C-alpha cells in the first residue's frame, strides 16, 4: 500500500521473502457503460423525426 | 462390513435341558435375540440323507455369523442359531465361539457349526 | 406429526439396526428429525406447521414485483398495510412460488402446511437413505469408494463423509424440483 | 449451558464411544464447547436469549443503506439516534437480513433466538460430527484432504486439513447459511 | 499405532498371594499402572456362561495389548490387566509375555489371555 | 500464566501420555509455552484481560481514516489527543472493526475480552492439536497420508508433513483470524 | 554456555534418543553447536536479553521514512540525535513495527520484550527439530523432497535435500522473521 | 463493495489473506441490441420505396 | 541396512571358564569388540521377576543383532553380547548363530537369545 504517490516508499520495488502473494490486475474497462453505438442511433432517430 | 451384506435372518436361541421322567433327557431351545446377520462358509459339508452333517471332529467351526454386537448379552457355550429361509429347508447351527471384531464392539463374529438342515427340525419356542 | 409419517419400526427395519442399544430412540428421533428438516429444505415442501410472519415489503421494480421470504399457503389473501395506504389491500398469490404483483409498507401472510398426509414415497426413500447413512457414518475416517481407505500420496479425495449427497437423497428428491 | 441442548450421552452414542470411552468426560466438555462455538460463529446464529447491541453506523449506498453487525431479531423495531435526528427513528427489519434503508449516528437493537427449542436439528447433527472428528484426531496423523486440482507450485502436500470441513460439518450445517 | 487407537482404559496390576489361615490361599491384585492402551484379538473365545473363558492350553495368548513403554517397570510373570468399560462387564487379562516393539522402547505389546468377563469380579485395590 | 488456563493434566489427558516418563514436566512446559505464542503471534490476540493501549495515529486518505491495531472494544469510546487537538475527542468504534473516522496524533483504548475466563475453546483446541503433534512427531522422517512412508521414485511429497502445522491446529486458530478486505 | 540454554537431556528427550543412545554425547553437542549457527543466522536475531542499541540511520524514501533494525517496545519513545538537529527528538513508535517518520544522524532505543528473555521458546523447536533430523540422517540415505512441480529438466531426482526445511525448521523459525 | 467512488476505502487495493476468492469480470457488451446492420438496411428499404 | 538404524551400543564378549578350587565353576566374560549394532525382536519374552527370561527351549533365538562384518573375528559358540542403555537395566544376550548377510561380507547378523535383564548383572572385564 505505501507505494501510492506521496508515500514512504513510493515507486520502489516490493520484496517478499517467501510465501508468494499472487496479484492479478483487474481490467475495469468501463469504457462502454452508456453503449455509444445503440445510443447515438436513438439520438439520430429522435432527431430525424423532428426534421433536423 | 457392508450393512447390505447382512442378508440372513436368524434367531439366536439358548438351550434349556432337563431329563424326562421316563429316564431320557430333553432339550428345549428358547429364542432370545432376533436380527439380521451375515453367514459365510469356511469348510465343506457332508450331508448324509436326512440332512444331518457328518463332520467327525465336532469342534471345527464351519460357518461364520456376524451380527450387531450387544453388550448386555453373553453368548455362552450353550447358544444355538436357527436360520430360516424362503424355499430352502431351515438350519440349526451350534455356536462354538465368539469374537468381538477388532474389539471395536460393533460386530460379533460367531464361529459356529452346522448341525442339521432338513425340513423337520423343531423350531424354537 | 412425524411419528405417523415415519414409524421408527420402518427405520429400524430398513437400516437393519434393531438389536444394538447404541442407537436408542432419542438419538434415532434426532436423526429422523434432521432428515425431515433437510427434506423440506432442499425440495421446499413445507413440513413445518404454521409460522405466521409479518415482514416489511420493499417494492422493487416498475413492473411492480413483490418478493417474499417464505412462500404463502396458496389461497389465503396476503394483506398489505401502511406505507401510505389507508385501507389495506388483499392479493392472492400463485401456488408454489413467492412472487406477487402489485411509515413503510408491510405484509403479513401465512406459511407452512396444516394437513398430515400427502408425503410421496419418493421423499421417504430419500429420508430412509439419509438416516441409514448417519447411523453408521460419523465424522471420522474420511473413507473412499466401496467404503475403502486410501493413502493417496498427494492428498485425499474429499467430500466423501458428507451425508445426503454420497447417499441417495439429494438425487432421490430432484424429481420434485424444477427450473 | 449446553447439556440442555445436547447431553454427553448422545455424543457418546453417536461417535460410537459408549462402550470404549476413548476420552474422559471433561475433555468431552471442552470439545463440546469448541463445537458449539464453531458452528455458532460459522453460520452467524447466536444461542443466548439476546445481546442488545449499540453500534455506530455510517451511511453509504446513495439510495441510503444501513448494514448491521448482528441480524436484528425479527419483529422488533430497530431505533436510530444521534446523527442529527430530532427524535429516535424507528425501522422494522427484514427477517434474517442486516440491511435497512433510511454528532454521530448510532443504532440499538437485540439479537435473537431467545428460545431453546429452535436449533432445528441440523446444527446439532453437524456438531455431533465435528466432535466425532476431534475424538479421534488428536493431531498426530496427517490426514490432509485435497481441494482444487493444480498441485501448489511450492510442491507441498496440499491444503484443507481442517476439522469440520473434511468431516461432514460444513455440508451438514450449510443448508442454513444464505448465499449472497 | 496412531495415538487415537489407544481407546481402552486399563489397570496393570501385580498380584501378591498369602495363605488363608483356614487352609486356602488368596491373591491380592493391586494396581501399579493406569493408562490408555489398544487391544486386539488373535483368537476366538469359548465363554461358558458366567464368563470364564474355556481355553484349554492356558498358555496361548488371545489378546494383544499395546501401551506406552516405561523403562523402570519390569512386567513380571505375575502381572494382570484389569480393563473396565462403560456398558460392558469388566475383564481380567493375565499377561503371558511382553514385546518391546521393534526395540524402539516406545510401546509395549503384552500378549495376554482373557480369564473372565462378568459383572462380579474383584476390582484391584 | 498458562498454569491456570491450560493445566498440564489436560494436555497429558489429551495426547494420552500420562504414563510416559520420557515427557518430563519441564519438556511439556516448554511445548505448552512455545505453542501459546507460536499460535498467538499468528492470531495477534493478547491473552491477558482488558489491556489498555496507547499508540500514534496517522490519517490516511483524503476523506480521513484511522487504522488502529487492536480491534479495541465493544461500546467504549476510544479517545484521541495531542496533534493539534484542543481537547481530547472521543469516538465510538464499531464492534469487531478497527477503523475510525473524524505533536503527533495519539489514541488510547482498551482491547481484550472482559473476564479473566480467557481464550475460548477454539484457541485451546489448536494448542492441544499442536502440542500432540509436537510430542509424538519430531522432525526426523518425512511422512505421508495416514502416516505411511512412501518412495515416489522422485521427490518426496513431504513439503510440509515433516513437522509443520499439518494437524487441524493451525486451521482451527484461523477460524478466529480475520481476512482483510 | 549453550547447554544452559538447551540442556542435553531436553535434546535427548525430544529426539527419542533415550534408552537408545544413538550418536554419543560429544556428537550431540557438536550438532547443538552447529544448530545455533543455522538458527540465528537464518533469523538475523542475536543472543542477548533486552538490549538497547545505537545505530546510524539513513533517510532513503525522500518523504522521510526511517527503517530500524529492531523492534522498539510499545510506549518507550526512541530518540534521534546527531546530524542536523538542535536537540534529541522524541518519537513514539508504532506498536510492533520499525517504521518511523519526521554529522551522522543516529538513533537509540530499547529492543526485545521488557521481561525476562530466554530465547523465545518457539525459535527452539526448530533447533530441537534440526538436531533430531541430524541424528537419523547422517548422510548416506537419499531423501529428497520436491520444490518445483515440473521436473528437474533431466533425469535428476528433483531436489530440496537440505535439512532444516525438510525437518520443519525453516517454517518454525519463520514466525520471528521479517518479510519486508 | 466499499471501493465505489466516494467509499470508505475507495480506490485502494484488495488484500485477502488466505482463502483465495476468485473474481471474473463479465463483459455485458450490450452494444448491438438493435442489430444496427440488419436495421439500417430495412430503413434504406422502406425509405427507398417512398422514393427518398 | 540404514546406517542410522544401527542405534544400539553393544560389547561383544567371549566367555572364559574355569572351576573354583572350592569345587564349583566360574565364568568370566571379557569384552572383545565394541561397536554400534541394530537389534530387533523375533519372539516374545517371559520376564519372571528378577528379570531372567523364562524361555523353555533355550535354543530358539529371540533377537537379531546386526553389526559391521569383521573378517578376522570368529564369533564362536561361546560369545555373548552385553548391551547397556541409558535409563533401562542392562541386558545379556547369548549368541546362538551368525549369518553373513547375503555373503556380501558387509554385515554380520547374530542370532542371539536374551538371557537376563536386571540392574545387577556382572559387567564385562
Q: How far apart are CA E31 and CA A12, in angstroms?
A: 71
H runs (alpha helix) in chain G: 2-5, 8-14, 25-35, 125-135, 170-173
D142 shares contact with chain E (CB less than 8 Å): no
Report the residue from D14, D122, D172 with minimal CB separation from C162. Answer: D172
Residue of D31, D36, D37, D40 lying closest to D12 (CA atoms): D31
Query: Using a CB cutoff of 8 Å and minimum separation of 24, what contacts does F171-174 make?
Result: F171/D161, F171/D162, F171/D163, F172/D162, F172/D163, F172/F122, F172/F125, F172/F126, F172/F129, F173/F39, F173/F42, F173/F43, F173/F122, F173/F123, F173/F126, F174/F43, F174/H18
Q: How far apart are CA D174 and CA D165, in angstroms?
A: 11
G65 shares contact with chain D (CB less than 8 Å): no
Cβ atoms of E107 and E69 closer than 8 Å: yes
Q: How far apart are CA D142 and CA D131, in angstroms?
A: 18
Q: Is there a contact between B106 and D20 if contact means CB atoms under 8 Å apart?
A: no
CA–CA distance from E49 to each of B14, B65, B97 (Å)?
A: 11, 20, 12
Residue B39 forms beta bridges with which residues?
Answer: B65
Q: How far apart are CA D95 and CA C69, in angstroms?
A: 8
Q: Do chains D and C touch (3 or more CB pairs under 8 A)?
A: yes
- To the nearest 10°, the Cα dihedral for F9, F15, F18, F21? -120
Cβ atoms of D21 and D79 closer than 8 Å: no
Cβ atoms of B113 and B60 closer than 8 Å: yes
For residue E29, give every residue at least 6 positions away whose Cβ sits within 8 Å of its Cβ, in sequence order, or none.
E13, E14, E15, E80, E82, E122, E124, E125
Q: Is there a contact between H12 and A26 if contact means CB atoms under 8 Å apart?
A: no
Cβ atoms of G133 and F140 closer than 8 Å: yes
Q: Which three cell numbers stand for residue I82?
A: 552385553
Residue F25 half-sphere exposure, CB side, CA atoms within 13 Å? 4
Q: How far apart are CA D45 and CA D36, in angstroms?
A: 11
I86 shares contact with chain G (CB less than 8 Å): yes
For residue D162, give every residue at least 6 positions away whose Cβ sits within 8 Å of its Cβ, in sequence order, or none.
F168, F171, F172
Q: Is there a contact between B72 and C132 if contact means CB atoms under 8 Å apart?
A: no
Cβ atoms of I102 and I109 closer than 8 Å: no
For residue D130, give every residue at least 6 positions away whose Cβ sits within 8 Å of its Cβ, in sequence order, or none.
C139, D35, D38, D39, D163, D164, D167, D169
Q: Specify the resolution in Å.
A: 3.5
Cβ neighbours, 10 Å, residue C59? 14
Contacts of D153 in chain G (CB under 8 A): 148-149
Residue of D104, D112, D106 lying closest to D66 (CA atoms): D106
Residue I99 half-sphere exposure, CB side, CA atoms within 13 Å? 8
Chain-centroid distance, C-alpha E40:
12
For residue A27, give every residue at least 6 positions away whose Cβ sits within 8 Å of its Cβ, in sequence order, or none.
H25
Taken in order F71, F72, F76, F78, the sign of the CA dihedral is negative
Residue of D163, D177, D160 lying closest to F122 (CA atoms): D163
Backbone angles phi, psi at F81, to 5 degrees: -150, 175
Contacts of C150 in chain F (CB under 8 A): 145
Q: How far apart are CA A34 and CA A37, in angstroms?
A: 9
Give a three-class secondary structure readout of E2-51.
CCCCCCEEEEEEEEEEEECCCCCEEEEEEEEEEEEEEEEECCCECCCCCC
Cβ atoms of F109 and F74 closer than 8 Å: no
Q: How far apart are CA D15 and CA C138, in angstroms?
A: 6
Residue of B1, B62, B78, B69 lying closest to B35 (CA atoms): B69
Residue of B70, D119, D13 lying closest to C27 (CA atoms): D13
CA–CA distance from C49 to each of C53, C74, C111, C116, D1 (Å)?
A: 13, 15, 8, 10, 29
Q: How far apart are CA B10 and CA B80, in angstroms?
A: 10
For residue A17, give every residue at least 6 positions away whose Cβ sits within 8 Å of its Cβ, in sequence order, or none.
G177, G178, G179, G180
Residues B14-31: b if buried by 16+ CB within 10 A, e if exposed: beeeeeeeeeeeeeebee
Contacts of H19 in chain F (CB under 8 A): 179
Q: How far apart are CA F36 and CA F30, in angstroms?
A: 10
3-state DSSP assignment of residue D105: strand
Q: Count how many residues are written for chain G.
A: 180
State which residue of chain G sits closest to I6, comparing Cα positions.
Answer: G22
Q: How far apart are CA B96 and CA B81, in angstroms?
A: 11
F57 shares contact with chain G (CB less than 8 Å): no
Q: How far apart are CA I35 and CA I83, in angstroms?
A: 11
Best residue in G64, G166, G173 for a mutation probing chain F (most F CBs within 10 Å): G166
User: Which experimental approach was used here?
Assistant: cryo-EM
Backbone angles phi, psi at H35, to 5 degrees: 55, 70
Cβ atoms of F127 and F32 closer than 8 Å: yes
Amino acid at each position: 500500500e505505501e507505494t501510492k504517490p506521496g508515500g514512504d516508499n513510493g515507486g520502489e520495488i516490493i520484496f517478499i521473502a517467501g510465501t508468494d502473494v499472487k496479484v492479478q490486475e483487474m481490467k475495469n474497462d468501463l469504457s462502454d457503460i452508456h453503449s455509444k453505438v445503440p445510443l447515438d442511433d436513438q439520438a439520430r432517430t429522435i432527431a430525424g423525426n423532428f426534421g433536423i | 462390513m457392508r450393512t447390505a451384506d447382512r442378508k440372513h435372518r436368524v434367531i439366536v436361541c439358548s438351550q434349556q435341558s432337563d431329563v424326562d421322567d421316563e429316564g431320557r433327557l430333553l432339550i428345549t431351545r428358547a429364542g432370545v435375540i432376533q436380527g439380521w446377520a451375515a453367514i459365510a462358509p469356511v469348510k465343506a459339508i457332508r450331508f448324509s440323507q436326512d440332512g444331518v452333517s457328518m463332520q467327525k471332529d465336532t469342534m471345527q467351526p464351519t460357518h461364520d455369523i456376524t451380527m450387531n454386537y450387544n453388550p448386555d448379552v453373553n453368548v455362552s457355550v450353550s447358544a444355538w442359531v436357527y436360520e430360516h429361509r424362503l424355499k430352502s429347508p431351515p438350519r440349526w447351527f451350534k455356536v462354538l465361539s465368539v469374537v468381538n471384531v477388532d474389539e471395536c464392539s460393533r460386530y460379533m463374529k460367531i464361529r459356529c457349526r452346522l448341525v442339521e438342515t432338513s425340513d423337520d427340525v423343531t423350531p424354537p419356542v | 406429526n412425524l411419528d405417523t409419517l415415519l414409524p421408527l419400526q420402518t427405520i429400524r427395519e430398513h437400516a437393519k439396526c434393531d438389536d444394538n442399544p447404541r442407537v436408542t430412540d432419542d438419538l434415532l428421533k434426532l436423526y429422523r428429525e434432521a432428515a425431515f428438516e433437510a427434506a423440506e429444505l432442499y425440495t421446499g415442501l413445507s413440513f413445518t406447521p404454521e409460522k405466521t410472519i409479518v415482514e416489511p415489503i420493499r417494492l422493487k421494480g416498475r413492473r411492480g414485483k413483490i418478493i417474499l421470504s417464505a412462500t404463502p399457503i396458496a389461497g389465503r389473501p396476503v394483506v398489505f398495510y401502511g406505507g401510505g395506504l389507508g385501507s389495506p389491500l388483499e392479493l392472492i398469490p400463485r401456488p408454489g412460488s413467492n412472487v406477487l404483483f402489485f411509515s413503510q409498507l408491510m405484509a403479513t401472510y401465512v406459511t407452512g402446511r396444516r394437513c398430515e398426509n400427502s408425503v410421496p414415497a419418493g421423499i421417504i426413500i430419500g429420508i430412509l437413505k439419509l438416516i441409514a447413512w448417519n447411523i453408521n457414518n460419523p465424522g471420522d475416517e474420511v473413507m473412499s469408494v466401496r467404503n475403502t481407505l486410501n493413502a493417496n500420496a498427494q492428498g485425499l479425495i474429499g467430500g466423501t463423509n458428507n451425508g445426503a449427497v454420497i447417499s441417495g437423497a439429494q438425487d432421490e428428491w430432484f424429481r420434485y424440483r424444477r427450473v
